[PDB]
Design a protein around this ligand. Structure first.
Ligand SMILES: *C/C=C/C(=O)N[C@@H]1[C@@H](O)[C@H](O)[C@@H](CO)S[C@@H]1OP(=O)(O)OP(=O)(O)OC[C@H]1O[C@@H](n2ccc(=O)[nH]c2=O)[C@H](O)[C@@H]1O
Lengths: 12, 692
């Protein structure tokens, strides 16, 4: 999010 | 010398073949014949980089550029190495420098675009990919990555041709046995046949096998019984996501819920400790926690696993960031199963099982997977919401006639606060009448104030969560204040139906937006609620919606929120419209935990069926559509037949507790049952077969 982080699945 | 040239060229093909060890040896012989051989240096660096020997790779790249100061390829390949090392500034210098030397160097433009994409600058990434494609129109890597950028921002220009182009490119690469430019983790987004998707995954598993063959490890001999482990099954969970990540947000309670009499749990982290409570919990509750990020060599790491005596090794990554599937390619364990982080087949012969379920992966469709199916009894999906977000088990509303999703309160101490109020009516949902108290809450919301006190209780504005307690904002702690959530905080109408989807925009395709527009046209009193995920997709969605006959103001965008606010604010919606191309998985558990009914249309890919499997376990078959018309009919019904909406919402609200969906203890015991099924099967000397 803005002011932080929102980790998500992502390709290697 | 030309003797050096033939050595260099032989090594190049040896690399192409994936004989990594042979290539390296020839490159070195080349440099022995002709030490000032810039290309040999650069080629050696490249195969060293392929093995993870990044410092040594850098040394030979710098050597090649020392010999040849305008060797553009060396700068570009050097920047790839720097990128893998996490040195993004270095890689930028390398790529940019390569383009100054040769502005027609397509690969360097493509490599610069990928840097822009990684940092989220999709507009700049799209622009550099287009230069790459302009300079070199047959460029599969640059085309497939451009296609993914356009997907991320919901750019559907020429969408149908793009899809056909992607299939043809993949078809051509698969025939020529090369590594396809469509990443396996993206292949459900494109209309590839199931066999192509399985083949893309298979090509990536093969990469792993090439990298470990240069180790010349002999097969491991595996335990044949449970005698050295006191009758306990040794299960090892391999993940790069033990920390602040959706994987931990789903399964962090499961290690500590294993039965110590029958199971011994080993957690192999592939990432370093990120300091969060997610990592603390898993470290504290597994029997054994091993930090394999400290052990970068896959030969030792697989040794380390094999010594622990693992019977079942659980691959929680597949082809996702941080994966180290070489570990599984080395087969340190007799049974290796894909579990929960990768929504697709690995296509790899070193993976024996995929833990799924009947609804996600019906046997009829077993051909999509290289692995044997291992059915959990309900859904294979799980979520830690009951533990992370217990303040959301109950809610109260304010009667500002009575809505369950306009002004909501949640709190661990909610009941005590309610008991301190003079007039409160139940409907079971407590309702606070519009007294002086009720106006102070609304006053705080309207005024953007962070918090207030009523009867000694702390009343927090749901938007100020990271200022009140940042660990509660992220899901690391349970909020210790009472939190107020309203439709006014998000510009949502108090007097209309709110359809929401909180997924990343890339999961929307043209068909899905058309369905959603059909739904909103039929329900004039309603809005679609979406996230700036990323914000540069917002204008494309808006435009396609307006070309579909949809005023701008029917679609309301919000920013991505911290984890707890994201889950909590789902209470404000009436209905979640799920993305059929790829469902909400984690986000589907989030929306159900808020009590919000979700309409879904299961496709054939695993990623297109997770949501329907969740609702089946939840016990809401009426929310599962068999085609687009049924999907629109279910959504329009829930937005117009308001007693039916009230009924379905109560069902979800209640069923998220009484069903197995969010029941991690029951899930951990089902998983155990399924493990012993896998083991006994193999302990009688059988090879992997389907477990139903
Ligand atoms: C089509 C590909 C789908 C995919 O990658 N799914 C994986 C799933 O299979 C794994 O099971 C999860 C790792 O264990 S991750 C992911 O599920 P998904 O529903 O796709 O969610 P993501 O897009 O990967 O991550 C979103 C993530 O961000 C949180 N969040 C969303 C909005 C917001 O405003 N704030 C916020 O914190 C969600 O809770 C969720 O973690």
């Amino acid at each position: 999010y803005p002011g932080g982080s929102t980790p998500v699945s992502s390709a290697n | 010398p030309t003797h050096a040239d033939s050595l260099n060229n032989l090594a190049n093909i040896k690399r192409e073949q994936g004989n990594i060890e042979e290539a390296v040896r020839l490159y070195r012989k080349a440099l022995e014949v002709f030490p000032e051989f810039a290309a040999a240096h650069s080629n050696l660096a490249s195969v060293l980089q392929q093995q993870g020997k990044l410092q040594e790779a850098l040394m030979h790249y710098k050597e090649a550029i020392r010999i040849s100061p305008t060797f553009a390829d060396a700068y570009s390949n050097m920047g790839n190495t720097l990128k893998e090392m996490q040195d993004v500034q270095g890689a930028l210098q390398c790529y940019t420098r390569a383009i100054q030397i040769n502005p027609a160097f397509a690969d360097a433009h493509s490599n610069l675009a990928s840097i822009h994409k990684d940092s989220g600058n999709i507009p700049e990434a799209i622009a550099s990919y287009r230069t790459a494609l302009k300079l070199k129109p047959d460029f599969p890597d640059a085309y497939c990555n451009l296609a993914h950028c356009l997907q991320i921002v919901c750019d559907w220009t020429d969408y149908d041709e793009r899809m056909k182009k992607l299939v043809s490119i993949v078809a051509d690469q698969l025939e020529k046995n090369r590594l396809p430019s469509v990443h396996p983790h993206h292949s459900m987004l494109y209309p590839l046949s199931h066999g192509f998707r399985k083949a893309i995954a298979e090509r990536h598993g093969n990469l792993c096998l090439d990298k470990i063959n240069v180790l010349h490890k002999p097969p491991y001999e595996h335990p044949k019984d449970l005698k050295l482990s006191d009758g306990r099954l040794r299960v090892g969970y391999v993940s790069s996501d033990f920390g602040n990540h959706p994987t931990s947000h789903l399964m962090q309670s499961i290690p500590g819920m294993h039965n110590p009499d029958k199971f011994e749990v080993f957690c192999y982290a592939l990432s370093p400790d990120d300091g969060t409570n997610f990592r603390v919990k898993v470290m504290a509750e597994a029997n054994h926690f091993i930090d394999l990020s400290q052990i970068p060599c896959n030969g030792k790491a697989a040794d380390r696993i094999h010594q622990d005596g693992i019977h079942i090794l659980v691959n929680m990554n597949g082809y996702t960031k941080g994966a180290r599937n070489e570990l599984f390619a080395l087969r340190p364990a007799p049974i290796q199963a894909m579990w929960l982080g990768y929504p697709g087949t690995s296509g790899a012969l070193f993976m024996d099982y995929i833990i799924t379920d009947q609804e996600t992966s019906p046997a009829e469709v077993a051909e999509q997977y290289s692995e044997k199916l291992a059915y959990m009894p309900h859904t294979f999906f799980i979520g830690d919401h009951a533990n992370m977000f217990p303040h959301l088990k109950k809610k109260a509303v304010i009667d500002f006639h009575i809505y369950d999703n306009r002004i909501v309160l949640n709190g661990i101490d909610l009941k005590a606060f309610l008991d301190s109020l003079p007039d409160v009516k139940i409907v079971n949902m407590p309702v606070i009448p519009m007294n002086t108290i009720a106006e102070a809450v609304i006053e705080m919301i309207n005024r953007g104030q962070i918090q207030i006190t009523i009867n000694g209780f702390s009343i927090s504005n749901g938007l100020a969560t990271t200022q009140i307690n940042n660990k509660a904002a992220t899901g690391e702690e349970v909020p210790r204040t009472i939190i107020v959530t309203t439709r006014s905080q998000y510009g949502l109408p108090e007097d209309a139906i709110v359809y929401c989807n909180f997924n990343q925009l890339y999961k929307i395709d043209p068909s899905t937006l058309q369905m959603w527009a059909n739904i909103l046209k039929r329900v004039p009193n309603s809005v679609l609620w979406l996230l700036r995920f990323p914000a540069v997709g917002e204008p494309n969605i808006q435009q396609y919606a307006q070309n579909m006959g949809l005023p701008q103001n029917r679609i309301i965008f919000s920013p991505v929120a911290p984890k707890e606010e994201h889950v909590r604010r789902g209470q404000l919606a009436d209905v979640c419209l799920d993305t059929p191309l790829c469902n909400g998985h984690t986000t589907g558990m989030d929306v159900l935990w808020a009590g919000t009914p979700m309409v879904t249309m299961p496709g054939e890919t695993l990623a297109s069926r997770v949501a329907a499997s969740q609702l089946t376990c939840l016990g809401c078959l009426e929310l599962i559509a068999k085609n687009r018309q049924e999907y629109e009919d279910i959504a329009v019904k829930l937005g117009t037949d308001l007693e039916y909406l009230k009924k379905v919402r109560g069902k979800v609200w209640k069923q998220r507790i009484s069903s197995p969906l969010f029941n991690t203890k029951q899930y951990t015991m089902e998983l155990e049952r399924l493990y012993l099924q896998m083991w006994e099967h193999y302990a009688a000397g059988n090879k992997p077969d389907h477990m139903i």
